[PDB]
Design a protein around this nucleic acid. Structure first.
Lengths: 185, 316
RNA sequence: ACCAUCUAGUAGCUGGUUCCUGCCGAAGAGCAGAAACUCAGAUCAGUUUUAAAUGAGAGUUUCUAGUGGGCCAUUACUGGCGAUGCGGGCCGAACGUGAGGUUAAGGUGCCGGAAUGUACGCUAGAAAGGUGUUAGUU
RNA sequence: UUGAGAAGCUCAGACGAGUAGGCAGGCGUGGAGGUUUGUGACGAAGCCUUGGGCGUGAGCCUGGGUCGAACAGCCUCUAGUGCAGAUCUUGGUGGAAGUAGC
RNA sequence: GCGAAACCACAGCCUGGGGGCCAGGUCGUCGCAAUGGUAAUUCAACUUAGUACGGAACCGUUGAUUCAGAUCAUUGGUAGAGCUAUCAUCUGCCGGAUAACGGCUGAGCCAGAAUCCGUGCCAGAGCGACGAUAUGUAUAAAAAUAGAGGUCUCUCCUGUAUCGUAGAAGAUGGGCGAUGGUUGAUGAAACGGAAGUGUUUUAUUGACUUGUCCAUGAAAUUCCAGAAUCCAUUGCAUACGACUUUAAUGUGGAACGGGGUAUUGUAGAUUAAGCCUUUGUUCCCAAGAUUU
C-alpha cells in the first residue's frame, strides 16, 4: 500500500537500510518525510563512525543528523540526473518532530529496524550523539523539546483512550454485534 | 587568521557576536553600552597597588572618550530557542516612539510622510489588549527577551538624527522579571552611566576607524580598561581626584573632529577602535575574570584637557 | 644580382586523390578465385579406435592479384589480438532488418533490470608476534 | 488459373563481421543519335520550403513560395562526369574586436 | 574620431581511475547562525625558602620576549591638524573530550598533555520577527526486544486492523424509534511557538440522513473507448563605487560673516580645513527626473 506522503520515525532504524528503503520510495514518485533523524542508529562502535567522519572532515562538511541522513540518501540516488534531483526534493528529513508532523501517524520500516537486524550484544552508535560530538550543538534543546512533545502526546493518548473506553463498552452493549458475529467482525 | 581576512564592518554599530551569559538569578539588567568614540585624554590614574611596580603611579594614558549616555529604550523583542537556532518569537516595542527612531526606521524621514509605526502606535495605544496578549505570549514562549533600545543621535549633538536601535537582550532575570524591567524601561532613555560606571576593564566592541584605501572593521577590545564616564553635559567630565576643578573631557576649545559630547561618554584608559563620533559598542564581558589586577581599581588622580589641537599642553 | 625560355628539369619521398548497394575475401611457394575436366561407380579428413567408426563428394594441370609485420598469454610450440562490433569486468559470445520467447558471462540493498531469498557456519572485508576469538590433534 | 518482359513466373533450403584485394548490379552530371502524336508564358530551368511521397542506399517524384525561357523521361553514344580535407586555387564572410593601436 | 593583424577542430571547475571516458566533489529596520577562518608564545625576579631533602618544587605576585588586534591623550618624526612610530599607548580566556601514562571495580568508569573539539573573536549563505504599504488525498503516546501497558490479575506475537463506504455521482415522498450523525454559513470563547496555520468547546442558522420499512424516476450512451534612487548635502567614510549624514518649510540644512581655537611666531595672519563653535547673516526648499 502506497500513498502520497508518509512520515517515518527514524528511531531504532539503521542508517543504510532506512536510506535505501527511502531512496527506492522516492524514485517511485512517493513523497517521504523522515522525523527524529537524530535517533538513527549505526552498526559498529562509536569510534568507527567517528573516524569515518573525521576522515570525511579532512565539499561542504555538515554536522546536523538530519543532513547526515540526507547525504546517505543522496548517494543512493541519481543526483547527476534531472530525475534524481526531482526525487531528492521530495524528501524532508528533520530532527525531532516538527509540530506539523506530530499530529499524524508515523510508520516504521521493519526491514531497517535495528532490533530485527542486529545481533543482541552488538555495539551500535547513535547518529545524534555522533553528530553532537563532531560539531552539532543542538541536542540539548532537541531533547528538551522531545520531552515536551512526548508529554503532550501522552496526554492526547490518555484522552483518546478515555474516549475509546466509552465506545468499546458500547460495542458489546448493542446485541447486533453478537447477533451476526459469525461473519468474523 | 582570527581577524583575517580584513573586512570593514558595513554596519556603523558594532554588532556584538555574543552577549554576557544571562542568568535568571541575577537582576534583570542590560550588558551593552552604545558608545560613540568621542575622543581621548591622558587621564592620569594613580595605580595605588602594593607590590605592583607602578605603585601609586599616575597612569597618564589615553582615556578614549566614547559618547554613551541616555539611549532611547523603546521596548522588547521576543526570542524563542528553536532546533534550527534562535528565532525571534515577537517584537513588541512601546506605544511612544521618537522622530530619531522613525528616522532610523526610514531613509528620507523628512521626505517621507512619517508613516513609521503610524497604525502600530495606534494599535499599541488603543488595542493595548492585543499588545498585552502578545507580551503575555512572549513571556510564556520566548526563551530570551531582546529589549529594544534606540540611541540619542538626534538628542545628543550629532549630524546623524537616526537613533541607533540595538536589540540589547535583558542580561539576567526571569521571564517575568525581564518583561517587568522592559515594561519599566518602556519608552525610556537607557543611560550608559546608569548601566555601568566605566571604572574598570570592560568588553568594549565596535568597528575601527576608517583609514582609507582599510579600517572600520568590527573588533572587540577584550578587558578594555575604562577610566571613568566622560559626562560631557557636566562640566566635571575630566575632573578627577587631583585634577578636579570641573575639567572637561573634551580638549580645551573642543575635541578634534568631535567637540564636546552633549551627553555622557565612556572614556576608557587605553585604545578603542573607531574614529571621532563613530558609534561604539561597549558591552559587558561574556565570561568572568576574577584577576586581582582587574579587581584592583586604579584611582584616577589627574586628567588632560589641553587644547591638543594647537597648544597640546594648554589645559585651560 | 635580376629577367625570359629551356621546364610539365631530377621523385625511392610528402600531402592529397570525388557516387551507392551487394557478393567473395586474405597474408599478416602458401593462403583466394576464374575457366577447362573427372567425378558417390571418389577420394579424402588439424578426428578417434585397431595393428574400422564418423563427417565431407573429391580432385587436379594453367594464370593472377594482395601479404611474407609484430604484440599478448599458457606450455621452440600452442593459441588470442590483429580485417571483429555485442553482454559482463579477463569471462561470455562471430553481427542482415524486426516481433516474441529463453539464456551465457556476470549479477538481484540503493544508484541498477533482477530474492533486504531459504538453509548451514567464521568474523577490517568485498620469518613470525598478539592474556584477540572459534573449532580440533597429542 | 489466365502467373512467356523464358531476360518471365514459381517451389524449397541454407546462409549474412570484414581491412588489402577481386567480382557484379545500380544512382548522378555535360554533350551525341534515335524516341516520347514528350513538357513549357494557363510558366521551362534554377532556387527556397517545420508540405507530402518512393527507394537499403546513390537518389528520385511531388505540393507551396520565388522566378521568367527553355527543359526532360526512355534506348544507345561519349566524356574536361560526382569532393570535407591536398598548411589545395580563387572569391566571399566571420570570432578575435570596436581589442591592439593613432 | 579613426581602426587593424596574427591565430581559430571543438570548447573551458577540480580529484582518482583508465580538456571530453568511468565514479565522486515592495522598501526599510532589528536579528538568527548553516558554514569557513582563528592565537597567543616564552623567559626572568620576588614570595614559597635557604624550607623540604649544598640546595628545590606547588601556589601566588611583579615584570619582560615574540606575535596579534587596536588607538594618537602624552612624546618623537613628517610640513596646529592629519598621518605615524615593539620611537608612543592599550588589550590579548576557560569548558569538554583525549594521547602517552597512572588508577577503580573486575570490559564499563576515573585522573591525565602547549594535543583535539568547543566558549570567545572574524566573515555571513539560508532564514526569522517588526514597520508602512486527486479518486475515501482518513488513522498523532513514550521505551524495550534478554519486556511494556491497563485494572495481585489481564493483553501484545503487526494495519488482512479501525473510522467512513447503497442512493437519477448520488433524485422525488410517507411511516416507526433516539436527541442521534454528517455538515455549509454566522457568532464566539479555550488550546497549539519547534516550522505553533491547526485542535476543540460550542450558541444559532441552512441542508442531508440508509437507524428501520415502504412508494414513484433512470432506459435508443440498445457490448469497452509610498517609498527607493538620481541631483544636492555630511565627513564618523572615500582610488571610483560604496558608507555615515542630513537633504523634500525649519536645532531645516548649505554657505559664508565669523567667534573661539590654536600654529608658526615675535603681537599679528591662517583663523577648521579631519580644531570647536555660532541667540549672526543670506540663499534655496520632492526641485524635478527615474524605478517599483
Amino acid at each position: 500500500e502506497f500513498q502520497k506522503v508518509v512520515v517515518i520515525d527514524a528511531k531504532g532504524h539503521l542508517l543504510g537500510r532506512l536510506a535505501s528503503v527511502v531512496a527506492k520510495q522516492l524514485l517511485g514518485g512517493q513523497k517521504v518525510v523522515v522525523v527524529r533523524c537524530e535517533e538513527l542508529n549505526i552498526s559498529g562502535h562509536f569510534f568507527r563512525n567517528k573516524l569515518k567522519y573525521l576522515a570525511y572532515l579532512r565539499a561542504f562538511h555538515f554536522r546536523a543528523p538530519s543532513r547526515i541522513f540526507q547525504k546517505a540518501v543522496r548517494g543512493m540516488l541519481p543526483h547527476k540526473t534531472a530525475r534524481g534531483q526531482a526525487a531528492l526534493e521530495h524528501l524532508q528529513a528533520v530532527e525531532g518532530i516538527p509540530p506539523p508532523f506530530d499530529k499524524q501517524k508515523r510508520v516504521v520500516v521493519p526491514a531497517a529496524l535495528r532490533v530485527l537486524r542486529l545481533k543482541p550484544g552488538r555495539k551500535y552508535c547513535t547518529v545524534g550523539r555522533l553528530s553532537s560530538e563532531v560539531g552539532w550543538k543542538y541536542n540539548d534543546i532537541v531533547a528538551k523539546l522531545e520531552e515536551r512533545r512526548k508529554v503532550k502526546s501522552a496526554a492526547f493518548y490518555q484522552a483518546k483512550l478515555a474516549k475509546q473506553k466509552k465506545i468499546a463498552s458500547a460495542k458489546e452493549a448493542s446485541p447486533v454485534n453478537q447477533k451476526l458475529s459469525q461473519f468474523g467482525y | 587568521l582570527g581577524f583575517l581576512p580584513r573586512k570593514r564592518a558595513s554596519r556603523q554599530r558594532g554588532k556584538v557576536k555574543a552577549f554576557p551569559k544571562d542568568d535568571a538569578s541575577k537582576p534583570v539588567h542590560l550588558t551593552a553600552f552604545l558608545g560613540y568614540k568621542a575622543g581621548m585624554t591622558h587621564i592620569v590614574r594613580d595605580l595605588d597597588r602594593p607590590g605592583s611596580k607602578m605603585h601609586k603611579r599616575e597612569i597618564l594614558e589615553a582615556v578614549t572618550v566614547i559618547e554613551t549616555p541616555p539611549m532611547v529604550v523603546v521596548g522588547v523583542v521576543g526570542y524563542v530557542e528553536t532546533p534550527r537556532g534562535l528565532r525571534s518569537l515577537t517584537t513588541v516595542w512601546a506605544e511612544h516612539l521618537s522622530e530619531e527612531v522613525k528616522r532610523r526606521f526610514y531613509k528620507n524621514w523628512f521626505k517621507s510622510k512619517k508613516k513609521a509605526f503610524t497604525k502600530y502606535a495606534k494599535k499599541y495605544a488603543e488595542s493595548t489588549q492585543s499588545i498585552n496578549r502578545e507580551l503575555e505570549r512572549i513571556k510564556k514562549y520566548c526563551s530570551v527577551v531582546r529589549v529594544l533600545a534606540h540611541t540619542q543621535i538626534r538628542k545628543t549633538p550629532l549630524a546623524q538624527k537616526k537613533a541607533h536601535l540595538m536589540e540589547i537582550q535583558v542580561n539576567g532575570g526571569s521571564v517575568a522579571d525581564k518583561v517587568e524591567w522592559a515594561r519599566e524601561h518602556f519608552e525610556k532613555t537607557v543611560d550608559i552611566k546608569s548601566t555601568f560606571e566605566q571604572n574598570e576593564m570592560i568588553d568594549v566592541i565596535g568597528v575601527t576607524r576608517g583609514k582609507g584605501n582599510a579600517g572600520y572593521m568590527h573588533r572587540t577590545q577584550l578587558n578594555s580598561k575604562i577610566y571613568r564616564i566622560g559626562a560631557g553635559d557636566d562640566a566635571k567630565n575630566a575632573s578627577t581626584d587631583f585634577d578636579a576643578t570641573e575639567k572637561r573631557i573634551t580638549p580645551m576649545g573642543g575635541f578634534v573632529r568631535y567637540g564636546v559630547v552633549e551627553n555622557d561618554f565612556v572614556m576608557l584608559n587605553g585604545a578603542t577602535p573607531g574614529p571621532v563620533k563613530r558609534v561604539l559598542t561597549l558591552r559587558k564581558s561574556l565570561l568572568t575574570h576574577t584577576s586581582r589586577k582587574a579587581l584592583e581599581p586604579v584611582s584616577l588622580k589627574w586628567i588632560d584637557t589641553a587644547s591638543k589641537f594647537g597648544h597640546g599642553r594648554f589645559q585651560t
